[PDB]
Design a protein around this ligand. Structure first.
Ligand code: COH
Ligand code: COH
Ligand SMILES: *[C@@H]1O[C@H](CO)[C@@H](O[C@@H]2O[C@H](CO)[C@@H](O[C@H]3O[C@H](CO)[C@@H](O)[C@H](O)[C@@H]3O)[C@H](O)[C@H]2NC(C)=O)[C@H](O)[C@H]1NC(C)=O
Ligand SMILES: *[C@@H]1O[C@@H](CO)[C@@H](O[C@@H]2O[C@H](CO)[C@@H](O)[C@H](O)[C@H]2NC(C)=O)[C@H](O)[C@H]1NC(C)=O
Ligand SMILES: *[C@@H]1O[C@H](CO)[C@@H](O[C@@H]2O[C@H](CO)[C@@H](O)[C@H](O)[C@H]2NC(C)=O)[C@H](O)[C@H]1NC(C)=O
Ligand SMILES: *[C@@H]1O[C@H](CO)[C@@H](O[C@@H]2O[C@H](CO)[C@@H](O)[C@H](O)[C@H]2NC(C)=O)[C@H](O)[C@H]1NC(C)=O
Ligand SMILES: CCCCC/C=C\C/C=C\C/C=C\C/C=C\CCCC(=O)O
Ligand SMILES: CCCCC/C=C\C/C=C\C/C=C\C/C=C\CCCC(=O)O
Ligand SMILES: CCCCCCCCO[C@@H]1O[C@H](CO)[C@@H](O)[C@H](O)[C@H]1O
Ligand SMILES: CCCCCCCCO[C@@H]1O[C@H](CO)[C@@H](O)[C@H](O)[C@H]1O
Ligand SMILES: *[C@@H]1O[C@H](CO)[C@@H](O)[C@H](O)[C@H]1NC(C)=O
Ligand SMILES: *[C@@H]1O[C@H](CO)[C@@H](O)[C@H](O)[C@H]1NC(C)=O
Lengths: 551, 552
């Protein structure tokens, strides 16, 4: 079998076979040397002794509110701190991208083929004696057993950080522009060839699909008006393929950028909000530029909406998730003096970690109604009956479920949760602790240390036997959360690098794009730099209801 | 008409319409302010006072040969100079890329659509009152008149720098991996979706083509043996589509990565050399890794060959071309402490400036024979008859034409030269002087200053009237060359930025790829760092004939 099965190279060393049963480690630029890149250089010794742990930093960022208030109101310090956040996080990501499901060594095929998700760690070789390499049993524990013992919800565990349904559907809507798995090809393949925040979930992945969705007047998107209210246009009207059960009434077959968005009325809420926003921006730009044509109005609006999305994601969405007293900032200018690659490739593991199915409530509570999953799935009727105002008001009030801490996956989505385990096994994922080491974390030494608890830990110990073969996805959902937090350490420490890299790595953040002229002048530039989730809803929802990502 | 037609914004300022009759210039990070970004900031004033002109820097690099001999032997100093050559040139390129033929403003379509060539300068708007904007006549001069008066070869003018036929065909072979115009769509569109040095002209653009060219044993490419010599396989054997006229027999239909390489035996020469190199590297890698399979051997060989190619392009090809006494260096590590984007998008203007048709000779001289264009085109029998050794020996000593200086396009490719002018106009290119300002060069004030001469200058003046409506491509071919040199100023100052961006921007040059293990260990890595045109030929051509890019 492959000599690198045991994962012998440490500290980001590269393993290469040199014979049938011999390997070598390439310690180039790791700060380490020796056979396995474990002997630190003198400079690395001092860097290690002085580096605070992720949990220490977390404690500082979530405490001393009085100091942060001062720091937040001095732009020089705010910028300084945000600059460090962006750079230190992004440095953990290979960019240009490296491995994928089929390639555990660098290759031109792996670099150039955009159909693959990329990989932060190379897959376990096909001939390895063990699923995780050399450690553990000949098979991983049964998929269903792990799910039932440790993942499935008994009683609803609300998020202590206060995340609501506005946050939960935003997460789903937003991420489904870059997590679009090509199930025809396999779990390691993507249909999102733009690999980032391109807004294909609004505009369509292809030019053919985009042009069917456009009005070709004033830069706007097609729409229908039901009950005086503006909604996405119809499948029949546009000839835009969508996924719908055969029984859905013609006029509730809404056509939007992303094919799967008719599945959940919560996604159509955001789909409707964003379509209105685009046409609102068209109106603004037509005012500033009576001379512009349909095409330029459309493209400029799209760039503006990308900017708005990135702004909201950092300053409202990640801000909420973090729990920090420090106010995160969206400012491309922070990187203009830094080394940074304005490109992104979506990683399979980033897809895997974002399976936040525990966020889902037991029922979806609109106005006086409480809908079960069966009633809510594929029911755009609910959206038309209640309206966007009521949707926002209700979902702002409804608490979401806790992700870490264990046992909070709703049984309605049990098949999806199991699929996450099975597919990551098909894609030969390395172990939790291998991923922790990859992102500068200390490997867990026991199951009890993972869960901060005894019962689930005991169950897991019987199932996996060795902590060093525990699986990434299940561990993320059972991990001891931070104090009164939605996530545990591994979720934050892996997720933040991928996230900031996808956000800042956008062409619009690059110096030749980050100018008012790109967005139609100061007016369009202002729309981006003052965007918020509140103003998104205020501008596009009748009655301007209060909203936020917390209850 | 569009308010920005007159290109009012200077120094990289971006023009935006603010009404039917009005514009605004965005001067962000240009170092200038004011209505048209022409009022310099204080720091900018100092920088402009102490900045040498491209001409004086060229002088320094082409003189003081003894000084440069010392400099070339001081690793620290060589690194410092080479580092500045890379950075100062690269900042002239937009990366991520901006405009294209359909988009004079920034847009997601322009950014994300790999089928377009990008544009260093936005096209002239569709409703502008003149082709160049506001200046000059309603119509440009007849391109046939321009071609005939100042472009067409009278007597052959040899290159003073001594470029040979090895250099001319290497240029053609190398660049045709990334200049692959999509004629079914138009001249602003490409088929090279990799936009750089991916070696698709060897391995194929798509995975289907690659798999048909591969042997699936030992990482190797399919081949055939003719008279004990290794050549590419046939169309019949691979089912690989190639462009060949009907009269070409089955056995002479060689199949290579790039569809058009059957056109020219000089191209098929390099195709055969590089196929041999691939299979040679596979042999070496199998010796180091008897445990590896076919797929890893193929892929790792591809990565090494990409390395070899960049190494050769910088240290042999650009070196010869530059005329410098300073030794250029391929070293990715020079950029590791620098702000640099490891990505590339091929620019339409880079394609246009690379139409070096004056390089071509009147006849192709192999051993005893002198083949006309008609006898040479599509005639791979010439290659089998003489062999690679005689091809290398013959092309090494045959001189190429001078590109700049006028009247040196061979009449055989008359139609191709005219097409370069026509297509430029079709793609709504801005004027020569606009492109010069775009690259920090002084605009020419007269046709005489452009040509350094009187006869062609006056003909051009009668055709164009105004120096500010002179077109880019004709100007490059008529421009006053540097002393005893192949190119004029505009060719080098536009060409170099596009070039180093394409070479260093390649993912293998990035810190995570530039490691011995990417290339299968220290042996594989050393193949890259010791690669040269001579060694490529020595290892792959029987007898190891001597070669270089100059006649000597
Ligand atoms: C954080 C947002 C979020 C939530 C709340 C969520 C909870 C829900 C939910 C309840 C309303 C429904 C009806 C769905 C339905 C689906 N989810 Co999500 N999943 C979410 C983010 C994801 C991710 C991540 C994937 C995997 C990527 C993929 O398959 O495209 C996913 C995939 C899907 C798929 C494709 C099948 C597969 O193989 O994964 C279906 C169907 N969906 N999930
Ligand atoms: C620098 C290398 C080089 C040389 C020596 C060269 C000299 C020669 C030559 C002598 C052997 C032959 C037979 C050809 C034949 C052709 N050249 Co070149 N051209 C070259 C680089 C180009 C470029 C640049 C173009 C523009 C279009 C493209 O490459 O897609 C070109 C285009 C072509 C085309 C049609 C494509 C188009 O213009 O759209 C033909 C036919 N060829 N040319
Ligand atoms: C990058 O831009 C290319 C040029 O715009 C584009 O190719 C174009 O695609 C359009 C729309 O798909 C094609 O137009 C089609 O229109 C109707 C659809 O009903 C059909 O009847 C026609 O057969 C036709 O295919 C054009 O053919 C084509 N335009 C060209 C070649 O100039 C690419 O699609 C873009 N690339 C991506 C990835 O989006
Ligand atoms: C910056 O813009 C240019 C536009 O090219 C210039 O406008 C020109 O000024 C001429 C007089 O110097 C006028 O005849 C005419 O209005 C205009 N020319 C053309 C061809 O449109 C502005 O003067 C200049 N502004 C500044 C402040 O320098
Ligand atoms: C580098 O790593 C290898 C493998 O991880 C180490 O070799 C193993 O060490 C353990 C000691 O706990 C033994 O049980 C194994 O049998 C050893 N051999 C193999 C082939 O796995 C090696 O010691 C490390 N080298 C250094 C210098 O630290
Ligand atoms: C990217 O990779 C995929 C998978 O390797 C390629 O799809 C394969 O293409 C071959 C030959 O074209 C088919 O025989 C296989 O069935 C495909 N594999 C699948 C569908 O999983 C794909 O062609 C590559 N993309 C590009 C642009 O080269
Ligand atoms: C591909 C484009 C990327 C878009 C970004 C998508 C999602 C961002 C949100 C969550 C990512 C997952 C975990 C990060 C959790 C908290 C962030 C705060 C940590 C920090 O700030 O230190
Ligand atoms: C994808 C791009 C690949 C690179 C293109 C390959 C070769 C470029 C060769 C010539 C380009 C035009 C003019 C001359 C360029 C450099 C000469 C020395 C100038 C310098 O060094 O200061
Ligand atoms: C409500 C749906 C959840 C079904 C899970 C039951 C199957 C897994 O068995 C679990 O064993 C655990 C031992 O620690 C018990 O604490 C759980 O109650 C039990 O569910
Ligand atoms: C041999 C010296 C070249 C003279 C320069 C050409 C001047 C115009 O010669 C033109 O070029 C072509 C050449 O066959 C012909 O097709 C045109 O009919 C002819 O007008
Ligand atoms: C559809 O949703 C509506 C709410 O308007 C509800 O009355 C109905 O029962 C739902 N239908 C199904 C099949 O769930
Ligand atoms: C092709 O070249 C061969 C030499 O190998 C020569 O004999 C023949 O005449 C040429 N064919 C044509 C059509 O010019």
């Amino acid at each position: 079998h492959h000599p690198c099965c045991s994962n012998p190279c440490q500290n980001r060393g590269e393993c290469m076979s040199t014979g049938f049963d011999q390997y070598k480690c390439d310690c180039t630029r790791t700060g380490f040397y020796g056979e396995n890149c474990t002997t630190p250089e003198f400079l690395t010794r001092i860097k290690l002794l002085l580096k605070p742990t992720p949990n220490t930093v977390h404690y500082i960022l979530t405490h001393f509110k009085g100091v942060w208030n001062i720091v937040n109101n001095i732009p020089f310090l705010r910028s300084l701190i945000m600059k460090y956040v962006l750079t230190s996080r992004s440095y953990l990501i290979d960019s240009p991208p490296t491995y994928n499901v089929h390639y555990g060594y660098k290759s031109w095929e792996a670099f150039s083929n955009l159909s693959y998700y990329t990989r932060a760690l190379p897959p376990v070789a096909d001939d390895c004696p063990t699923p995780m390499g050399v450690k553990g049993n000949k098979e991983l524990p049964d998929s269903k057993e792990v799910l039932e013992k440790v993942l499935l919800r008994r009683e609803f565990i609300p998020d202590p950080q206060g995340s609501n349904m506005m946050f939960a559907f935003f997460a789903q809507h937003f991420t489904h522009q870059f997590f679009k798995t090509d199930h025809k090809r396999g779990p390691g393949f993507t249909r999102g060839l733009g690999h980032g925040v391109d807004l294909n979930h609004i505009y369509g992945e292809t030019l053919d699909r985009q042009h069917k969705l456009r009005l070709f007047k004033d830069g706007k998107l097609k729409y229908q008006v039901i009950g005086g209210e503006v909604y996405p246009p119809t499948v029949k009207d546009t000839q835009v393929e969508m996924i719908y059960p055969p029984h859905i009434p013609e006029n509730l077959q809404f056509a939007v950028g992303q094919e799967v968005f008719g599945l959940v009325p919560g996604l159509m809420m955001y789909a409707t909000i964003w379509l209105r926003e685009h046409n609102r921006v068209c109106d603004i730009l037509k005012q500033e530029h009576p001379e512009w044509g349909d095409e330029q109005l459309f493209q400029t609006s799209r760039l503006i909406l990308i900017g708005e999305t990135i702004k909201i994601v950092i300053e409202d969405y990640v801000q909420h998730l973090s729990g920090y007293h420090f106010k995160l900032k969206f400012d491309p200018e922070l990187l203009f003096n830094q080394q940074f690659q304005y490109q992104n490739r979506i990683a399979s593991e980033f897809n895997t970690l974002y399976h936040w199915h525990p966020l889902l409530p037991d029922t979806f509570n609109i106005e006086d109604q409480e809908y079960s999953f069966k009633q809510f799935l594929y029911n755009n009727s609910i959206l038309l009956e209640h309206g966007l105002t009521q949707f926002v008001e209700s979902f702002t009030r409804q608490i979401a479920g806790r992700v870490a801490g264990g046992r909070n996956v709703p049984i309605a989505v049990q098949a999806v949760a199991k699929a996450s385990i099975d597919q990551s096994r098909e894609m030969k994922y390395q172990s939790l602790n291998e991923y922790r080491k990859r992102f500068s974390l200390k490997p867990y030494t026991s199951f009890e240390e993972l869960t901060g608890e005894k019962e689930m830990a005991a169950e897991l110990k019987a199932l996996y036997s060795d902590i060093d073969v525990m699986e990434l996805y299940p561990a993320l959902l059972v991990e001891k959360p931070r104090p009164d937090a939605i996530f545990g350490e591994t979720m934050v420490e892996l997720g933040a690098p991928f996230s900031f890299k996808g956000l800042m790595g956008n062409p619009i953040c690059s110096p030749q794009y980050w100018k008012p002229s790109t967005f139609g002048g100061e007016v369009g530039f202002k729309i981006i730099n003052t965007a918020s989730i509140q103003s998104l809803i205020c501008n596009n929802v009748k009655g301007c209801p209060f909203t936020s990502f917390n209850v």
